[PDB]
């Protein structure tokens, strides 16, 4: 039976009784930096049980007229435990991730979700001259949501959040070129993606650069009949993997 997993990281454990396979990045598992690729020449810090564990974000409600949600990935964990405290005292850092999206409903509900992970998901603005400001591009472990309409040009600094363009000007059906899974309420209950470190430099600052984006888009909308449960949540759980830091300084 392929339907059961068990993931153990630190002092936390996930158990699943209804699951698909585990998608591993681009075939690569996360690992520490080697001596041939290093450029910063002082010794890095590896706490490795205090940071590499499962942190759970907030929950969102899947409604019937629901369009989608997104998260910027080294930003939702910026106030979570000892992971968000090492980011404030250090200048560099590199991390791999393990994402577990989970949503349960009965055999009398239907719907489908696409869970992708997009590296360098640069987004656009509703006014054609400006760029979006920081408060709309991300939130502290709170979802920013798409909408089925088009944001007008009368606003100045807001993200263009039409779902069929995916915020980036591309087709939403072609997002399956990135590592992804589906959640089908007929057969599935969760989705698990393992992502390595992807950048053009061996280390980077985690406060000026978001290098991953997790999107959850309902392709088939949620439907049920009269009498069934109307409230269906979605919960996301992220665990850092093989994290290390460089450049101690003041607290920023």
């Amino acid at each position: 039976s392929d339907r059961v997993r068990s993931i153990t990281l630190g002092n936390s454990t996930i158990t699943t009784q209804e699951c698909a396979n585990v998608v591993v990045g681009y075939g690569v598992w996360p690992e520490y930096l080697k001596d041939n690729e290093a450029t910063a020449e002082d010794q890095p810090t590896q706490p490795d049980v205090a940071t590499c564990r499962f942190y759970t974000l907030e929950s969102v409600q899947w409604m019937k007229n629901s369009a989608g949600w997104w998260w910027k990935l080294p930003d939702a964990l910026s106030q979570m435990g000892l992971f968000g405290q090492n980011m404030q005292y250090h200048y560099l850092g590199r991390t791999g991730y393990t994402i577990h999206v989970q949503c349960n409903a009965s055999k009398f509900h239907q719907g489908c979700l696409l869970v992708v992970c997009v590296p360098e998901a640069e987004m656009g603005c509703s006014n054609l001259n400006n760029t979006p400001e920081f408060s709309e591009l991300s939130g502290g472990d709170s979802a920013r949501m798409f909408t089925d309409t088009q944001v007008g040009e009368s606003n100045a600094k807001k993200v263009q959040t039409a779902v069929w363009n995916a915020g980036m000007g591309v087709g939403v059906g072609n997002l399956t070129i990135f590592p992804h899974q589906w959640i089908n309420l007929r057969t599935n209950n969760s989705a698990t993606l393992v992502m390595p470190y992807i950048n053009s430099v061996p280390m980077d600052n985690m406060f000026r650069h978001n290098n991953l984006t997790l999107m959850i888009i309902p392709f088939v909308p949620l439907n049920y009949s009269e009498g069934s449960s109307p409230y269906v949540p979605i919960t996301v759980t992220i665990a850092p993997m093989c994290a290390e830091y460089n450049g101690l300084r003041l607290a920023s």
Binding site: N21, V24, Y26
Partner: protein
């Protein structure tokens, strides 16, 4: 002088004249494929004839 194989559906000769490796010609004959890292990026391998979920 390098002697290569001259793509058909016969050989040719190639000599480098400059001191920098950025001055050479294009590669044009490096045929390598690895489609499995995009099409099957899963943890446990999946046999085609077996069902996906047991």
């Amino acid at each position: 002088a390098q002697v290569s194989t001259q793509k058909t559906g016969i050989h040719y000769t190639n000599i480098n004249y400059y001191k920098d490796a950025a001055s050479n010609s294009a590669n044009r004959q490096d045929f390598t494929q690895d489609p499995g890292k995009f099409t099957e990026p899963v943890k446990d391998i999946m046999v085609k004839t077996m069902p996906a979920l047991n």
